Design a protein around this nucleic acid. Structure first.
Length: 125
RNA sequence: GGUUCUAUUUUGUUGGUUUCUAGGACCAUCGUAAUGAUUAGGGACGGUCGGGGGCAUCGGUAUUCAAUUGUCGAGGUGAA
């Protein structure tokens, strides 16, 4: 209904999850599809870029009803849902958008990056 | 007994002239003969650099908490 011709998307990609939403050019959503929303949860068997491509592709089905052309992605973290490889999966979503009738606008890396990169130890909550 | 005059020396005091001696303030230059390529200390004037200091403000990103919308499972690990 909205017919917002471009919009942003943050690709969240933690170790188990790879949902892909695609919002408009202002902020409010219209469509997000979860990894569990693509039927699977089995914790260890959630990692790879291969099953993560399917969850990110079912986004395009309901995104059709609005009609977003250029999806401008912001990748946060790297992981996804698995059928094969343990480890990365955030590269999956970019392939899903590119294979559908949706277009890529720009690729941005939007991560909380510290200066020195360790795991934290030393101080409160 | 001593007085008086004259000459000389010494001590104190005063004045003109001649000659000689102490003491106080401030500043220039570094010459050459006795260890041999020496501007050794403090700055004033005029430009200049820096995350040196303390305080008072201000801005941005990320995280967390609280409230509200759209949307249904996640987080961890070598497996758990």
């Amino acid at each position: 209904d909205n017919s917002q011709v471009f919009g942003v998307a943050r690709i969240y990609a933690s170790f188990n999850d790879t949902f892909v939403h695609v919002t408009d050019l202002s902020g409010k959503e219209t469509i997000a599809r979860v990894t569990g929303g693509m039927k699977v949860k089995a914790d260890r068997d959630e990692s790879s870029p291969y099953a993560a491509m399917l969850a990110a592709q079912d986004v395009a089905a309901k995104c059709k009803e609005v009609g977003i052309t250029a999806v401008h992605v912001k990748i946060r973290a790297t992981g996804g849902t698995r059928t094969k490889t343990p480890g990365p999966g955030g590269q999956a979503a970019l392939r899903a958008l590119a294979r559908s009738g949706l277009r890529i606008g720009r690729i941005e890396d939007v991560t909380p990056v510290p200066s020195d990169s360790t795991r934290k130890k030393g101080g409160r909550r």
